[PDB]
Design an enzyme around this catalytic site. Structure first.
Site, PDB file in Angstrom:
ATOM      1  N   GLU A 239       4.684   5.003  11.548  1.00  0.00           N
ATOM      2  CA  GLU A 239       3.235   4.849  11.641  1.00  0.00           C
ATOM      3  C   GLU A 239       2.901   3.837  12.727  1.00  0.00           C
ATOM      4  O   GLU A 239       1.844   3.922  13.353  1.00  0.00           O
ATOM      5  CB  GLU A 239       2.634   4.392  10.310  1.00  0.00           C
ATOM      6  CG  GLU A 239       2.772   5.408   9.191  1.00  0.00           C
ATOM      7  CD  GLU A 239       2.183   4.915   7.892  1.00  0.00           C
ATOM      8  OE1 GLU A 239       2.199   3.682   7.682  1.00  0.00           O
ATOM      9  OE2 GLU A 239       1.725   5.758   7.087  1.00  0.00           O
TER      10      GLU A 239
ATOM     11  N   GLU B  28       0.825  -1.203   0.000  1.00  0.00           N
ATOM     12  CA  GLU B  28       0.000   0.000   0.000  1.00  0.00           C
ATOM     13  C   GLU B  28       0.863   1.258   0.000  1.00  0.00           C
ATOM     14  O   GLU B  28       0.485   2.269  -0.591  1.00  0.00           O
ATOM     15  CB  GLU B  28      -0.951   0.041   1.202  1.00  0.00           C
ATOM     16  CG  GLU B  28      -1.964   1.182   1.085  1.00  0.00           C
ATOM     17  CD  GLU B  28      -2.789   1.391   2.339  1.00  0.00           C
ATOM     18  OE1 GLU B  28      -3.510   0.457   2.741  1.00  0.00           O
ATOM     19  OE2 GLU B  28      -2.713   2.493   2.923  1.00  0.00           O
TER      20      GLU B  28
END
Ligand SMILES: CCCCCCO[C@@H]1O[C@H](CO)[C@@H](O)[C@H](O)[C@H]1O
Ligand SMILES: CCCCCCO[C@@H]1O[C@H](CO)[C@@H](O)[C@H](O)[C@H]1O
Lengths: 423, 42, 49, 146, 442, 99, 42
Positions: free
Chosen positions: E137, E60
């Site tokens: 993240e 992604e």
């Protein structure tokens, strides 16, 4: 497959000034909103926060329905009742299946035309002002935008959307009754509906929304300029720099909207580098710590604010801010490709159309147009007007910013955050 | 209403990717509901 | 990362019918509750006596 | 801080300095709310080592002999790191801070940069202050000469 | 102007076609001058092994960083310059890449999705840059107590199976994953028969299909027979995971029983039941007057900052339950009232509260399918989950047939005397002991 | 003579001799407690004083001089509008509680 | 020390007379003690 429609928006202005607009989209659910010229700009220094408590009081007892009934009755049909405020307007909106619009409409009318503001109910609600405000203020952006308006204006638009701490517990039933009587009047309202018939909607307005009196008055907002600095230590500094631009509706406003997209007004690709964001690329050239920057555009009935907003590590605030500013300066000096203006127009045009594709986005737009210009302008025309903006207009909007008296607000560890006179 | 808000309230960022989109770009709007979490846009 | 947190292996404690991680445990739940509840009912009968 | 802030004058004087200067003299005499509970032992040790130094001190005494006082200073107040981590010039900036709070009475202060203490110009400002009026002289008087 | 029933028939039926390689192409035509088009794939961490867990999430981060035809920020510049928006998301079972753009720009949009989905560069240096972005993240997500608690819920409820895995993967995998792992993963999973090109808006199915044939024809419809990734069922385990951290101001608790799985009819009644109990948060205007007993008690007694019921579905299982956030001294009361409510629905749901739940559900369904993006997503995900788009009129029939009896029987079936999975994080000294929680199930 | 017996009864009841108004003597149940909580400052404070004055007289087993007795014709129901609404609200909730 | 402050703290004016002297005239000074109420002058 082959969709039934597309019907057209129907518009009506009653003799008393109330506007009624609707679109029968044959959707399973309906959306009704009563838009009012009652935003915080209408508060003065003696009743600050009144429209905020009012926003939180949609559920209190009314002449035709008890507080208990409003909640249970709306929930029984799976509906919704919400209140949205901007510095200029308040929108009471209800949602439900189309067979239950008579129930929701009645509650909506009771809330907006027959509130009782019972002393004990008003007292019990005051604490919610603190909770509502603390929740909103967890977002540094809220701090910064609110302070920016306080620094830019001398009055009206200077007022916060949130109740001042000193006023919490002090807003009285009387101030609420007066605020409603002063601003919730026919000449200041627009009833908008989706998935509803216009005759019905119109008849409802005629019978229940003929409210005479009040004030269509309102002091112009006086742009002043200035800065508010909120030192608080966060590793990241949030800052906004703006100058007065143009009142919404004007042609110059469209140039500022185009300038905003030339500059960069929000991400287009998940985790992208913002290749076509002029402001972002300029900052990225000089700073190498994480950061974010974006053009900022706020347009109101009699004024507007345009500039940029930055978020950076505390030590790099000045570098980021000056870099963003210098980039707007190059535009003001005429450095702007027609291709870039075309890209900007593409973003603006698509962004606009996407903003009104949901029932919610559509209602807000119609409602806002109804109050700001007492008319409806379709997409086709908006795109035309956007196309009509010239590269010269963009360069000029940029000049106005550069030479205009500034307003600034920042929050964080401001050790390295420049004052306006250092820019 | 029936739909729960995007973020339920109660009373982060460490990368440039997660920071993009955080800068404000339009005037503030505050919402209050009967059935849905409050929100503040911009 | 909290994603580095994995539940320790319990195969040494599991009842045999729930040892296969590729099978639904619901297929044996009534049998497992029946066994324990049977111990409870019998006990209560003995106590009533 | 809450006790000090019951006096509106404290509010106003503190904000006036924050509005006048870009740094240094801009700092409040009271801890910022966000810092309450966050001031660390290390920041306190550091502040003392940086500023409580011999070149930055003066030991004054009344009803005491100078030799004794002097000997005390020599034996116990010879603190190195002396001259310490001094500061920078206070940069007058100018500006305004407005605190809306509804009291029936408004407290306000308007100023401009004058002169550093010690200078001769400072004495003229001190005289100008008394020409203008700098506090009562008679209980319940009309301040005839203010 | 029509009635509610009449309007359900107002909905344009969704059109579905299939390319020879097996890719399904579906769309719903409206008059919108904008549209949303994207590719939904039957790929997610549930398909990952411990060795490549995190691969899809890694992909992604690469998907929009450049293709063979549009290297580097080229793809980016093209999407931006036409005013379009490119997004993506990965769950444990599905992955989607979609674009929001002007309807007139549909051809270019479909070409770009195709380019992204088949010619993504996966440049070695890009991969290395993304390692650090993913690691940051992971640190950010650690600060989201809600994300932590839900990953913990999956970790214990589905311990020992692919569903226990987080979507992001363990930090060690993020550090070690190689380009080869990513291509092997994409090779085995990105096949025409496992994808759906979906579009919603002002466009015609015929044009969509022609663009599909034009741009996705070369999409592989065969890995072979040695690969065909197939999901085995994932065992649910009544269990508990408690991460005590008295340094955090509020406790997060998530509790759930095993749910039925996507395609089960029972999901409608469970959704009605969950709507009866509902959601809540301190900013709700309702307070003491809210219909849900859990919500009114919570509001009047200040039991929590918030709560939400949920029904997370997977192929043949899921998590049915609730999540709440509260003060360290209110955990036991919250749990007590929540379980009391499940028990009351199993044995005593009333016709009127059930009608209320049905009405809440109807409103949620229709209001959610508002805008091209939500509808586009419903098309893509539905074809993957149900194998077809279930029309609103059908949902209406399924909802209409639910009554108090059905709610009692379905709730009893999934909640009554069943072992729950429990996850707690924060100042949870007061979170009830598992045995006590288990006895609250009857 | 019902109105005639009324004034007779009012004086026989005798709460007026302690300076109380009829509403000061109502039995406090939850409806009444809520109604008292809803009273405006002045009505609440006056009520408190009359009750306090009456409890004091009762403790001394004394009564007020006749000229200070609450007069039948001047006694008014200050609590009625509040209590009537509290009861209405509870009834409404009770109706809703039936399906 | 031995002397209690003029005003002990805990946690307005209606006439000109009572207001005279309220306006500040010098920089602020804050005092803290072991035995005496704190004060803030000017
Ligand atoms: C948070 C402010 C109060 C909200 C308005 C509802 O107010 C409540 O209405 C009930 C009737 O159902 C009354 O019985 C109750 O005493 C009253 O406080
Ligand atoms: C036990 C399940 C109840 C049966 C519900 C079926 O419902 C039907 O499904 C059709 C297929 O999409 C729709 O076309 C039709 O309008 C709908 O009423």
């Amino acid at each position: 497959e082959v969709p039934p429609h597309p019907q057209d928006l129907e518009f009506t202005r009653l003799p008393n000034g109330l506007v009624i607009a609707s679109l029968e989209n044959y959707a399973p659910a309906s959306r009704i909103g009563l838009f009012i010229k009652a935003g915080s700009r209408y508060e003065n220094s003696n009743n600050l926060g009144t429209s905020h408590l009012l926003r939180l009081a949609s559920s209190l007892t009314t002449k035709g329905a008890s507080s208990f009934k409003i909640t249970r009755g709306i929930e029984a049909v799976g509906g919704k009742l919400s209140v949205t405020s901007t510095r200029e307007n308040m929108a009471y909106t209800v949602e439900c299946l189309r067979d239950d619009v008579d129930i929701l409409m009645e509650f909506l009318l009771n809330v907006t035309t027959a509130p009782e503001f019972r002393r004990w109910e008003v007292a019990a609600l005051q604490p919610q002002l603190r909770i509502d405000k603390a929740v909103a203020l967890q977002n540094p952006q809220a701090h910064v935008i609110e302070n920016l308006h306080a620094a830019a204006y001398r009055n009206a638009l200077a007022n916060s959307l949130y109740c001042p701490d000193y006023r919490i517990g002090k807003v009285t039933p009387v101030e609420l009754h007066d605020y409603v009587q002063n601003h919730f009047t026919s000449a200041r309202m627009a009833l908008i509906g989706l998935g509803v018939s216009h005759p019905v909607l119109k008849q409802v307005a005629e019978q229940f929304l003929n409210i005479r009196g009040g004030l269509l008055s309102g002091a112009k907002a006086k742009y002043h300029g200035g800065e508010i600095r909120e030192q608080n230590g966060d590793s990241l500094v949030h800052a906004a720099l703006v100058a007065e631009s143009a009142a919404i509706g004007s042609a110059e406003a469209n140039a500022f909207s185009v300038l905003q997209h030339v500059l960069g007004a929000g991400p287009h690709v998940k985790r992208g580098s913002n290749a076509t964001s002029s402001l972002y690329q300029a900052v990225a050239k000089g700073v190498h710590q994480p950061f974010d920057v974006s053009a900022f555009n706020a347009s109101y009935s009699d004024s507007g604010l345009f500039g940029f907003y930055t978020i950076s590590q505390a030590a790099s605030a000045g570098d980021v801010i000056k870099a963003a500013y210098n980039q707007v300066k190059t535009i003001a000096q005429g450095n702007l490709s027609n291709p870039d203006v075309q890209a900007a127009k593409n973003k603006l045009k698509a962004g606009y159309l996407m903003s009104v594709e949901s029932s919610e986005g559509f209602l807000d737009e119609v409602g806002s147009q109804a109050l700001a210009a007492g008319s409806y302008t379709p997409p086709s025309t908006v795109l035309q007007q956007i196309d009509a903006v010239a590269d010269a207009d963009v360069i000029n909007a940029a000049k106005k910013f550069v030479s205009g008296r500034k307003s600034m607000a920042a929050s964080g560890n401001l050790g390295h955050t420049p004052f306006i006179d250092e820019l | 209403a029936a739909v729960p808000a995007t973020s339920e309230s109660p009373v982060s960022v460490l990368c440039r990717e997660s920071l993009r989109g955080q800068a404000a770009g339009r005037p503030l709007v505050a919402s209050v509901s009967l059935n849905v979490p409050a929100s503040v846009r911009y | 990362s909290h994603t580095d947190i994995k539940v320790p292996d319990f195969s040494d404690y599991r009842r045999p019918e729930v040892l296969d991680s590729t099978k639904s445990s619901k297929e044996s739940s009534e049998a497992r509750k029946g066994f324990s509840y049977l111990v409870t009912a019998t006990t209560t009968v003995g106590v009533a006596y | 801080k809450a006790v000090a802030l019951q006096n509106p004058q404290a509010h106003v004087i503190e904000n006036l300095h924050a509005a006048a200067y870009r740094n240094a003299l801009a700092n409040s005499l009271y801890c910022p709310d966000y810092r309450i509970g966050k001031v660390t032992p290390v920041e306190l040790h550091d502040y003392v080592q940086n500023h409580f130094t011999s070149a930055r001190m003066a030991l004054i005494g009344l009803g005491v002999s100078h030799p004794v006082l002097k000997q005390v200073a020599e034996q116990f107040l010879n603190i190195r790191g002396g001259l310490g981590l001094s500061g920078a010039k206070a940069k007058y900036h100018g500006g305004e801070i407005r605190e809306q709070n509804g009291d029936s009475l408004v407290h306000a202060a308007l100023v401009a940069e004058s002169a550093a203490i010690g200078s001769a110009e400072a004495n003229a400002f001190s005289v100008l202050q008394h020409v203008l009026g700098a506090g009562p002289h008679v209980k319940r008087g009309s301040n005839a000469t203010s | 102007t029509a009635t509610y029933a009449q309007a359900l028939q107002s909905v344009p039926e969704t059109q579905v076609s299939q390319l020879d390689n097996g890719l399904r192409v579906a769309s719903e035509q409206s008059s919108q001058p904008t549209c949303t088009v994207g590719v939904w794939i039957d790929a997610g961490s549930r398909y990952e092994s411990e060795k490549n867990n995190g691969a899809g999430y890694f992909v992604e981060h690469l998907a929009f960083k450049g293709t063979k035809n549009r290297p580097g920020n080229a793809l980016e510049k093209e999407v931006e310059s036409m005013g379009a928006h490119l997004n993506a998301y990965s769950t444990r079972e599905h992955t989607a890449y979609y674009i929001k753009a002007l309807s007139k720009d549909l051809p270019k949009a479909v070409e770009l999705l195709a380019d992204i989905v088949q010619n993504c560069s996966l440049e070695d240096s890009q991969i290395e840059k993304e390692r650090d972005v993913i690691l940051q993240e992971l640190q950010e997500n650690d600060t989201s107590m809600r994300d932590v608690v839900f990953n913990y819920l999956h970790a214990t409820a589905f311990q020992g199976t692919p569903l226990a895995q987080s979507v992001e993967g363990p930090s060690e995998n993020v550090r070690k994953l190689s380009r080869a792992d990513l291509t092997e993963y994409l090779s085995r999973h990105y096949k025409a028969p496992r994808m759906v090109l979906a579009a919603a808006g002002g466009l015609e199915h015929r044009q969509l299909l022609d663009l599909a044939q034009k741009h996705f024809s070369g999409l592989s419809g065969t890995y072979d027979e040695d690969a065909v990734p197939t999901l085995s069922p994932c065992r649910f385990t009544g269990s508990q995971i408690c991460h005590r951290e008295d340094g955090l101001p509020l406790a997060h608790v998530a509790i759930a029983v095993e749910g039925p799985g996507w395609a089960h009819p029972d999901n409608v009644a469970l959704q009605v039941a969950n709507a009866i109990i509902g959601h809540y948060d301190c900013t709700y205007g309702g307070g003491a007057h809210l219909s849900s007993p859990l919500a009114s008690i919570a509001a009047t007694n200040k039991l929590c900052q918030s709560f939400q019921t949920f029904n997370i579905c997977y192929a043949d299982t899921g998590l049915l339950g609730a999540h709440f956030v509260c003060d360290h001294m209110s955990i036991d009361d919250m749990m007590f009232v929540l379980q009391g409510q499940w028990m009351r629905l199993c044995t005593s749901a009333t016709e009127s509260e059930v009608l209320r739940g049905k009405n809440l559900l109807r409103n949620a369904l229709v209001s959610h399918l508002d805008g091209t993006t939500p509808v586009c997503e419903d098309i893509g995900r539905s074809l993957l989950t149900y194998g077809r788009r279930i029309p609103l009129a059908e949902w209406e029939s399924r909802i209409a047939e639910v009554d108090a009896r059905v709610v009692r029987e379905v709730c009893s079936k999934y909640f009554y005397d069943q072992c729950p999975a429990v996850a707690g994080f924060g100042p949870i000294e007061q979170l009830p002991d598992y045995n006590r929680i288990r006895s609250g199930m009857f | 003579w019902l109105e005639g017996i009324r004034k007779w009864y009012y004086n026989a009841a005798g709460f007026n001799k302690l300076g109380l108004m009829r509403d000061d003597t109502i039995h406090e149940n939850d409806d009444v407690k809520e109604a008292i909580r809803r009273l405006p400052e002045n009505l609440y404070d006056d009520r408190v004083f009359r009750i306090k004055r009456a409890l004091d007289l009762s403790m001394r087993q004394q009564i007020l001089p006749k000229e200070q007795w609450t007069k039948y014709e001047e006694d008014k129901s200050y609590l009625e509008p509040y209590l009537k609404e509290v009861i209405r609200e509870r009834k409404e909730r009770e109706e809703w509680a039936k399906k």
